Symmetry: C3
Subunit: 295 residues, 3 copies
């Protein structure tokens, strides 16, 4: 796209504020931002807020979201689809033109770990170029295992293809498959989907802790066989809904756009890889690390 040549829009922080007991404002941008997806490989991604996947959104069950998208792309329209919400797609997930803003309102009444993404046609193009993310909706009454959890993090799986190449997006294997982490609390890492960051700067834990991960596989195209090396999931909640409670899973199957909450214990000091167990994808980037120490 001629109007994207040389464009590299600096990342913009997510803006969010509560405006009622059951009402939240969220303000995001659509923007064109260079991301290093593999060492030496820059992808001029289509993004929310200059991150790919986009920034984490966390709301409460029963919150109405008043969402504003500011489109900074000079030529391409963009939009937003939150899987958390009940909405009319043809009224509420509509395009925002270049240099314009749009505001849409809709409720999040289901707890869980949901994908969000651009909904502009062709949706494959927009998701593959980087316009994906996660929204977490916290359950009103928690999970039954809350009291057991010592530490939690967010992980997101996505793929990267040949740059802006619809033939590859439709017909080709992924070039890279990658994890990212998004911050839930101050000090947590906040990273983009790349092959290396979470190997060089592992997630941190302490020996004997129960860890919870909020996970989502945003695709665009692949399923994920999510596994943490050296442990067994004690508890799994499919899509993060507390009702969908599995126990003792070695590996969690996630569809494209599929989420879960998973919990496991790290018993011994060391580095624990986190993978999709489709090992072709792992080899192409999808290995993160959890370093577990005595302190």
């Amino acid at each position: 796209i001629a109007a994207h040549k040389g464009v590299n829009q600096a990342p913009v922080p997510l803006k969010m504020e509560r405006v009622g007991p059951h009402d939240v404002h969220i303000e995001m941008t659509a923007q064109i931002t260079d991301i290093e997806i593999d060492k030496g490989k820059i992808y001029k991604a289509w993004t929310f807020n200059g991150q790919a996947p986009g920034p984490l959104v966390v709301v409460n069950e029963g919150d109405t979201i008043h969402f504003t998208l500011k489109n900074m792309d000079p030529v391409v329209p963009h939009s937003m689809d939150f899987h958390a919400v009940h909405a009319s797609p043809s009224k509420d997930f509509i395009d925002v033109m270049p240099n314009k803003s749009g505001t849409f309102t809709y409720p999040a009444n289901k707890p869980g770990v949901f994908m969000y993404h651009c909904g502009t046609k062709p949706v494959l193009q927009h998701i593959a170029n980087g316009m994906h993310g996660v929204i977490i909706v916290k359950p009103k009454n928690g999970y039954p295992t809350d009291k057991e959890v010592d530490r939690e993090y967010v992980l997101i799986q996505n793929e990267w293809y040949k740059y802006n190449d619809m033939n590859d997006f439709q017909n080709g294997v992924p070039s890279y498959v990658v994890f990212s982490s998004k911050a839930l609390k101050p000090g947590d890492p906040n990273t983009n989907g790349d092959t290396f960051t979470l190997k060089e700067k592992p997630l941190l834990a302490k020996v004997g802790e129960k860890i919870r991960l909020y996970i989502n596989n945003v695709g665009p195209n692949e399923v994920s066989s999510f596994h943490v090396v050296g442990t067994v999931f004690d508890d799994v909640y499919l899509d993060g809904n507390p009702n969908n409670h599995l126990q003792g899973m070695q590996t969690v199957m996630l569809p494209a756009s599929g989420g879960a909450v998973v919990e496991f214990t790290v018993t011994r000091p060391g580095t624990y890889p986190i993978v999709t167990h489709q090992f072709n994808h792992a080899q192409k980037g999808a290995v993160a690390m959890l370093k577990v120490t005595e302190t």
Copy 2:
């Protein structure tokens, strides 16, 4: 196949009748029928009854099926495998030769949403060329959420490949991935697996309704990440068995031949896309629409 050149056998209605409180007769054909799978693209499909996927079959839990297959194919043998039934494959799912008929009998004692398909070797060939479908077995005591459902439809996912090309069927990506709808009540649409019909003639609903879909992914080869845009599944029953009850799923993973019953609420007027969230497949056809109006 030289004996299929110029062959286009008109579709034949499914014949079905109850012959006892727990016994049903079903009569199908195997036939060679031109189907428009994408605009301008005709596939000379191998079919049941001149539909691909085939006609919908609905029976009750505990029904014995007395199934007759009339083979209208001039040269290829065909057969039938219902996933609903307990049967001896080597006695009851056997070939029927060109211009012959065969009758087989077997019980359907498990409720759910089952694939059927030709079972003739090579089974890949027969399924890929179009010989697939769904049988629904209604549970004796219903689903616990029956009283909530306002409207229901059947959707089927399948792929199309290069015509009758076993190398592509085994080694290639699908050319098209498509939804079809099969009628449960008078007035419901009844369509073939194509890229366009359910976009141009969307399924219909009213604002505020709870919708149930009976879904099956017949493949041959792909899994499906089934999602309805703008809603969350309130209830999911894996394979349509009432025991396998999930809640609040954004996306349902279906294996190849996998089924479910899914229920969701449409809250607002508009058009709601239905997709597999493996967006390469969506781009290649697998997007249906649900138009939701005040009336």
Copy 3:
């Protein structure tokens, strides 16, 4: 690998012994062994004990495993990762050099049907060349359906690619996809992952029996849509954990490394195929047979 040319190390029996009420010794080798994966096709596999998949391991819930790996490979390091265990990957799943041994200790406190595999980098290479298997951990209090089961077997799904070709392992479709069976009791078959053995020498059963299969899809790369032709699973336990109990499934989705316990009834004499319902994979080898007789 020049140092593997002409190497064909005879298979070595698994060594296992109980050494306490909650403690077991297991001794395996890593070795280079020619396996016929398809008729006329020899793969010089990287293996545990000269089998691919490796030998079956069965322990009890709460057993500590004292595992020894003797590396017979002349040049490549190997290691072992059991998905059953809680362990530090960077201390306990480490490499054993050529012509050396290493012993590692760790608990199996979760019941189920777990993958094991080499964990040496690149793990894709080691798994794809044949270093995979299953460990079963028997639940302390059984499964609720134990009293119903008449007969049981172990089945494993894996893929084979072009020989030792990392580009194919990462980017290509599988050449073959195959089932194997591993013995649980004297007289049971014990086979390698190949396209033919379980078609020519089917698993055996009697009419009216309830069969249990312990299944795992070791990959490396594919998911599996596991189905037995002519029946419906009465009961499924995901990953073999008794809590994760489904009923009446036609087909079980398994992630890569995913396991299950499945139970079904064979009602009539005949041969019942067992497949992954991703029929491209079935066509490439993944069809086993269960011959069901009056005796």
